[PDB]
């Protein structure tokens, strides 16, 4: 059904590097150059206070819509990924439901500034205190710490491309019907990522990558915090939360 569902040659692995990097380039929601330029554009003490004074439900809704928009670009990235559209729909949905949020969490390090511990949010950079109204300080600080640790790796756009391809194509996701097909596609993407690192003398980052349990913890923490919020404001979830967000998380 696809060349990457079988053993690929070196030349075919080189093509895969280029294909993933291209799919990533085209599905970037935010340009790296725009993100770095915006670093000096920081929310004022008054803007911070204004976000903090927003009701818990209002803040949750704004964050849910922004997450949804990020997810939309990840679905497009998946569709453009070699072999993804050749998997069955059950498997595509299994991969996106378990991995979309994980991809968004990795992509986030680009919009995060390790210098002053700020993140790009609604046009400006702000510290974690910006999200205080959400009432999930442990999750937010765990998200800022993850972005901080990925920032210290100084990933290129091509490294993010390949590492995110691998975050999504995980043959271990519960519910995959064509597991062996996912295993071969995963093997080839692993080879494409490790090949690119070898060629660019960047293999030293492999031991530095976060353990898989780290992305899972962040994802389980998001699911848990959403359950607490849903109990408090069930009609907010039902009436004002985006349908794609709910399909993925509830």
């Amino acid at each position: 059904e696809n060349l990457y569902f079988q053993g690929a040659s070196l030349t075919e692995i080189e093509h895969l590097v280029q294909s993933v990097c291209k799919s990533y380039r085209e599905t970037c929601q935010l340009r790296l150059e725009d993100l770095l330029r915006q670093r000096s554009n920081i929310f004022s003490r008054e803007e911070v206070t204004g976000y903090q004074r927003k009701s818990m439900w209002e803040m949750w809704e704004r964050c849910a819509h922004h997450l949804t928009e990020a997810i939309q670009y990840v679905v497009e990235f998946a569709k453009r990924l070699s072999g993804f559209m050749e998997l069955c729909q059950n498997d595509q949905i299994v991969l996106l439901k378990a991995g979309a949020m994980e991809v968004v969490l990795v992509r986030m390090c680009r919009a995060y500034n390790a210098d002053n511990r700020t993140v790009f949010f609604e046009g400006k950079y702000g510290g974690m205190e910006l999200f205080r109204a959400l009432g999930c300080s442990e999750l937010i600080s765990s998200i800022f710490d993850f972005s901080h640790s990925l920032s210290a790796l100084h990933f290129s756009e091509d490294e993010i491309a390949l590492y995110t391809a691998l975050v999504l194509i995980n043959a271990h996701r519960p519910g995959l019907q064509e597991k062996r097909k996912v295993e071969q596609l995963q093997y080839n993407l692993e080879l494409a990522f490790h090949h690119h690192l070898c060629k660019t003398h960047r293999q030293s980052i492999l031991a530095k990558l976060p353990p898989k349990g780290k992305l899972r913890s962040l994802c389980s923490q998001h699911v848990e915090r959403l359950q607490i919020f849903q109990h408090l404001h069930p009609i907010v979830v039902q009436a004002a939360f985006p349908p794609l967000y709910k399909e993925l998380f509830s």
């Binding site: 679905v75 569709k79 949905i93 349908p243 399909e247």
Partner: peptide
């Protein structure tokens, strides 16, 4: 519903 729609829309 949405995920299905996004995957099928080319």
């Amino acid at each position: 519903k949405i995920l299905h729609r996004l995957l099928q829309d080319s």
